[PDB]
Ligand binder design. Sequence first.
Ligand code: MG
Ligand code: ZN
Lengths: 170, 147, 55, 56, 222, 14, 110, 7, 1112, 94
Amino acid sequence: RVDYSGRSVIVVGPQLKLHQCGLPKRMALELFKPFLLKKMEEKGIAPNVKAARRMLERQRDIKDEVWDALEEVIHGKVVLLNRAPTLHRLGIQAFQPVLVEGQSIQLHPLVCEAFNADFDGDQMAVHVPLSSFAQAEARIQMLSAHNLLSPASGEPLAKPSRDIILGLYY
Amino acid sequence: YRAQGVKLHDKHIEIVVRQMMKYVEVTDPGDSRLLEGQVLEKWDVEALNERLIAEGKTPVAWKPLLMGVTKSALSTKSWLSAASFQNTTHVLTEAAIAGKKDELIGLKENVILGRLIPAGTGSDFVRFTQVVDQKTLKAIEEARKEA
Amino acid sequence: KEVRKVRIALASPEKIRSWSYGEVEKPETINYRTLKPERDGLFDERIFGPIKDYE
Amino acid sequence: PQEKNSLKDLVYQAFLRLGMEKTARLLDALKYYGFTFSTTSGITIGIDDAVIPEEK
Amino acid sequence: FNPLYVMAQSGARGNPQQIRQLCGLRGLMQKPSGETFEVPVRSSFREGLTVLEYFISSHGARKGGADTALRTADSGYLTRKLVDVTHEIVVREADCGTTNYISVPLFQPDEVTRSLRLRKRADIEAGLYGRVLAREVEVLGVRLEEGRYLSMDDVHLLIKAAEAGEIQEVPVRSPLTCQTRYGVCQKCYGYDLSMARPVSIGEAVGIVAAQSIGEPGTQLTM
Amino acid sequence: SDPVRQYLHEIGQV
Amino acid sequence: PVSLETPIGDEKDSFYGDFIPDEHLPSPVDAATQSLLSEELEKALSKLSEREAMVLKLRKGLIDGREHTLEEVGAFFGVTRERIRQIENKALRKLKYHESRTRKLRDFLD
Amino acid sequence: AXXXXXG
Amino acid sequence: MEIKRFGRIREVIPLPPLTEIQVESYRRALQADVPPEKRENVGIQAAFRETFPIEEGLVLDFLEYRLGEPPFPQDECREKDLTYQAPLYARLQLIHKDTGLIKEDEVFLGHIPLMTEDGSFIINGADRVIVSQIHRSPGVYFTPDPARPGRYIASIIPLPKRGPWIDLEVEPNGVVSMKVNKRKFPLVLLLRVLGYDQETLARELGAYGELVQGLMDESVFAMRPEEALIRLFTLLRPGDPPKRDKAVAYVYGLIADPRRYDLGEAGRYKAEEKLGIRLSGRTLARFEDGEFKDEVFLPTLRYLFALTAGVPGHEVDDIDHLGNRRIRTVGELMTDQFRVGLARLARGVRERMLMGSEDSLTPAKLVNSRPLEAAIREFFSRSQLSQFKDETNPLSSLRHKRRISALGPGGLTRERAGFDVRDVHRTHYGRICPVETPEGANIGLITSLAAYARVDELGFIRTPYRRVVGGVVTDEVVYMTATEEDRYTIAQANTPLEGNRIAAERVVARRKGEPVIVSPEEVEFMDVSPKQVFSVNTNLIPFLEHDDANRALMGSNMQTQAVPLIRAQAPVVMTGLEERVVRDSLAALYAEEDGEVAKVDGNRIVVRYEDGRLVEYPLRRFYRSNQGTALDQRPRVVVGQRVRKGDLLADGPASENGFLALGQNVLVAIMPFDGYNFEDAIVISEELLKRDFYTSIHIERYEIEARDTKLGPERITRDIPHLSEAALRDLDEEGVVRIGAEVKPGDILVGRTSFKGESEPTPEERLLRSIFGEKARDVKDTSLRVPPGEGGIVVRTVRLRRGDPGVELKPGVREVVRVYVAQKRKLQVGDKLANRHGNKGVVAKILPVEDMPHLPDGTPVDVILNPLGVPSRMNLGQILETHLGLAGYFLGQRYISPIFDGAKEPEIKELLAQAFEVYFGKRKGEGFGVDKREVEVLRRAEKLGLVTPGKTPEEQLKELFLQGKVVLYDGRTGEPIEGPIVVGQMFIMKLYHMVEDKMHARSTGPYSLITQQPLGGKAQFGGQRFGEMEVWALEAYGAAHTLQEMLTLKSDDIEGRNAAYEAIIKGEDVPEPSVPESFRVLVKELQALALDVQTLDEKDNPVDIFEGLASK
Amino acid sequence: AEPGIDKLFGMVDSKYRLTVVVAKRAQQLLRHGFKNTVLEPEERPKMQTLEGLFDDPNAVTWAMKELLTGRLVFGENLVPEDRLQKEMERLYPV
DNA sequence: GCATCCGTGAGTCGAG
DNA sequence: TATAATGGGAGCTGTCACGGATGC
Ligand SMILES: [Mg+2]
Ligand SMILES: [Zn+2]
């Protein structure tokens, strides 16, 4: 089992670019919590680390600048989304997270086929790669938009299906 | 797989079948310490045979051996891999009696120990790469030009 | 140093005694009142170490 | 008419010739137009759309 | 422009048989034994099945569900067996310099045994695309060199020359012949099929193979 | 096989 | 006592002990807090001369671990116990002013 | 209970 | 609200009491209302009768038993976490045979749990349900030998744990073998012990094909019954001395002893019918006049040989036939545990009878009731068939009470369960539902009793059929077993009838499950109803005949998962069973006799009956179910109302005017929308939230104990160290949050202090203490706080204190406080929705009203479902539902459409026409013509062949409307959708899988004891499991550092994780991992196995990963 | 996709070597607070805040861009490790 | 050489 | 610390899926 990791129900978000995904605000706050303490001390939001953590302990103690600080924390970084069962390497992919209201993780439509996820209640787990090395591996080799072909057959994996095919055919 | 309309490159299938023909059974030990029937890797028996021919000795007569994935997996060299698969007690006794060493060649071993796997960013081929800008590279070039 | 190999072999009774920090003599766990480790028991502090750091 | 196989071959060829950056852009585009058009096209399902042929 | 027809043709949703059940007859049904009822379900779903028709179908339904549930398990097991028996295989060098290779046959013996016939395109693509020629191959006045990574077009051309009877089998670098220890080299392997370029030295081939063989396992019957 | 049965036999010997 | 490997649930996938938190070892938060405490205390003990800072480090045990009496820090520094206690007082007091000013060490008092 | 999620 | 019903099938009988399988079974087992002398020998009475007399000399016999009244009422038991149960007394008498002295006393045996009115139990405060078990019936069976084609195996099976399975076989050497306890020996020997002589076996088995010669052994008759008996004992018991009385005792106990060997009444009956003989009892043989006498063995051998020869009138048995499989209901299962516990009590009795003061012994001194109590408590607590009750809605509970499990004690392990056990057998018809089963690992092993089906006294399931004589259908109904059913030709319920006469020349019928077309002259019986084929859940799916079974399965399953909604509605389209479900589940409250309603309150209703008596009915209000859903009843009558018998008084949860309400009727459009309904995702209107559609109430229970400690007592208090008045604001004088207070994550529900574990303050703390000049407090803050992601309004607190009346807690506990927290949940993004046809999906988008597709008259739709969910799923019922829904929307009506006798397309078209007149002719009167956009759409429809070209706009719009389709305007543009869209009302439910209960995230948190890895689970603030396969995935990307991080810094590398956190909060890059603690654990566990695991460098010199700490 | 990813894959014999280079460079920038950057002020990757455009905090983003400029050198054994460390510490203190 | 016994395996999360 | 007492009980049964080792 591992630290820095969450899970929620997936929901379709077609507004996302291929390399993106919708990560709930509360989820992201708890996942990046140390980075957010650091960025909070890097601005005027808190005196120090412990003051910031005690500040974030209760939900009514949480204000507006903190979400902007969090926005600044996650910039450029990618999370890992994983859907069990993990049958081949594209069961885990890297996305730049985009903070969203609500409690649901928003998945990009094209990658669905590779996760074998629909939206009839499926869930997914989020993992926050920590080091600079980890992040680099994720953004180069593990990014969804970098993996466009099946390591199995060679043919495309992210590719139009359902509504998309329908619209273009029509 | 074709039957079910699954496109799947022969490559992978050949990698596995390759792991299936990994082993051989001696039919005549020749001038070796080996034994008639004793099973070993085709690689190791070819190295021994080349060392024995290089010594002007009799090479080892051996037979190609096919074995299915499970046996072939348990039959690995690295006992840390074999133990974490199946028939743990068997593997572990065999190894402890043999006083076996695991060279941490595979991924499984390193995964268990929590090392950096010998793969991808962890390949000995690429991990030793260095990076430097032209400014620092020239400053260091001046330091090397000094001495 | 860097760990490059891992060996596995039989433990001689002498090796086992070398590892040992003491022989457990009693089939006793912790005292039924003080809830502390018994002497020469499975949870003795005299053998396996202190319960508290540096105490 | 554009369907599954042809769109697949388009994405392959696009990967090959124009790289994964452009193929990503193209994919997101295809996504946008495909969905937006599917919306307005008027595709629905009513019981009469299962047309039993007389031949039967 | 009928919705079912559209969704079917486009590959957006549905196959002929499902559609057939929606409109035509449902079809023949199976007894729990594996035997087939002499009486077919004459109704469509749009018409509405009888009680007895529904009950007759339930057998098949239950059987298929049980097939799913009991399949997932053994497919997983196979995946894990494969992962364990291949895990140590990674692309370790650029070339093992083996002079050995395999010969992918473009023609297979017909079941009539009358002659040899060409193999299916998909199949030849499965054994050729992204492979490296271990010998010089010249057909239709084009020169395919020793060392060349067969792009998809190279394959198609090779099929075209095959139909022209200039070539019956293709010499290629294969893992079955690689002599790289504890792995395979770059040439013997071939294209990193995920990127349609040669495989990067250091890519965990074994795992990827086990996963590629694994994933569709949950689609194969019991 | 069964240690009870065994000891009972060894006792049934004297 | 009850078994730690007492099955929970109708599957083999759960043990009672799998639910039992390990209170003993310190969490990363706790250890980090102790590190920042030691570093902030060193930051506030550098605002004293090395003498008074060293007497405050010997009377509280941030040095050899234990707390020395006034007679031992007075014999070590070569002063009277009244004097060693006096510079302890002025160190404590200067520390109290430093704290009333910067307010850095307030948050650690829980 | 199991499958795509009836129960 | 007119309710129009369709269909021509007249149901001759209503459904039986739906919980009867529970209630009647338990009532039968207890016989609590039966005067002792009138009790039948069944149930616990039979258990007593098998256990007693207890002998060895003293003798303790049994007279009768009695059950007293429960010490606490059900409600009070639910509150105090007590079992609802009745005291059991047994009247016992002790005879000393020699003295003649008789001492008689009533001894207390402990308590037995009582079944509530609705068929469930209360065990330690929690509602529980005993699930019926299906198993192989006892009896004699003949099956084909899979090894030898012309050869057969005989099997004699008794009740579970009532003795061994015995096999008879004809060996390749021709001798007939018996197998008992995995011991193969020649049957001949046993036949000799039974008293059989070579003459009798020769004349009995003679006719057969020399098989009898394999039974011929000279050496066996040479030993007469005594030596043969000792020979067999030596064969079955190696090493055990072959004493005569030991052999007699052993063989008797194994074969003839009704106390150690029992075929059921079922096994006995079936064996009788199969071998064509008559049994004196439930054992294979008897001990009569000093010797052993045969019952079963010879007839069984006779049959086996006959079947092997090919002699006509001998069949193998289908073991999956529902004639050979029976149901153990609550009564039988409980009785089985009771019998075990009684046997243990008897071992105890005999124990105490050997020891003692032998002159003074009362029944009281002899009976220790403890083992009996233990067996009962064990059954009701830890048995596999005893399941925490599903009360999510009333259908959940009912279905749960109607479940059948092939698993459990003496049942199938899922590992042993292949396709044959899980199949729908032909005999399931009318008995066990073919549709309703789980998709996962339990498929076909857990099932549901069919709606008309009843379990008989023998445990076999029986289904009703109407008698038919000379083409005339009687109102006589006969319930048959599958074995019985197999003898007849039975017509389908939908066969046309004029009066009571069969009106078709060709009628569809079954013979042994096989479909066959017959004349009315040959029809012996007829189905009662299509309804009888399916479960209660499946009977709730309208237009079922149009849905593929696989999707029907899902709709069935998901109804169980519906959340009670504050505004819940009955379906626009119903199957007609929606009222009976509410009634039989005891959800709603009903009038007892005719009368006038006296008082009506939110809290209670008072009725005056014709007797003149006032009856007061309390209402259950905002009670928390097992699953946390709100269960409360709301009064449906007003003061002075005249009510007749069985009239509705109050609606329970998920009830609208006595009809089952699992969800909402919403106006749906079936079209794609901008990718927001892609892959089963669902788009909804904000208008649903605005009007509180899909709003449900949920109550959570938090609990905390203050106990005595060695370090001093914990206490519930308002005085909590280092907390502001801000944090204590909503706490009362005693330290408990006030009723009505809003609590959010981090807030204190119950303040608690505990004396600190003895502290070595670190020098940092001593110095910091000197600096702030404040004494470290004696105690610390242990208070109960609201967990992450939870919260709401406090509606109740319970406080139980030691030293208070009625109250005794578990040892060491000073007090227990419970806080109940209620929330109103509005539908949100991520909540799961579904319909009865198996269409399910998560809400992906909530659109403002102006963004929604709307009808030309300005009315926006509620829900947008993707049509792509249809073709591949082949569930067209949802479509028909929608069409009829459309009609119902404009006509203001609801429908009853019975399964397989429904509304049909033509009638729905008529109704749709009517509705068109309402939807349009209104517009024509209001002064508006057809819209331009309508004209454009009409043009496209004409191209689609949807409407006939040349008709007026009105005639064409009517044509579309009759196809169920309408013009729709996009709310964003105002331009019409280019085709006409299907729109109508659909019944959709919100399921219990809610994103609010699911979302979870962790930075750092608790670690496991031995492994030092993060805990699992949301309640424990756990981390996600990164399993073997996720590892394979990372390896395949060759992402080595991310992986190494997962294996070290983010899990069990202690120094690593601490250093990582410290580094991140400092803004420093994370440091290099070191050895994970679980590898260290591996090493130590291998050392304890006497293996030496050594980490070496490349020079083969040891490296210490324990950093010297483990090396002396 | 990451901007210019095709060229980046073009610059190396193995994609993983690209990752190692990018990552090591990112750590060099973090350790030296970006003072060692080869990007000119106009080439600096930016992030939109509420105030206005600011420097992009993401060192990996930076590294990829520098790699994209051609201003970086990479390969095995360009220089002994301690010498590189000490020189970079001399030129840009942290 | 060919029947036969015993011991080891039997997918993934999440919640219990 | 003192009549004499001298061999035990519970099994538990619808799955393979073979794998090797052991036996006429
Ligand atoms: Mg799904
Ligand atoms: Zn090679």
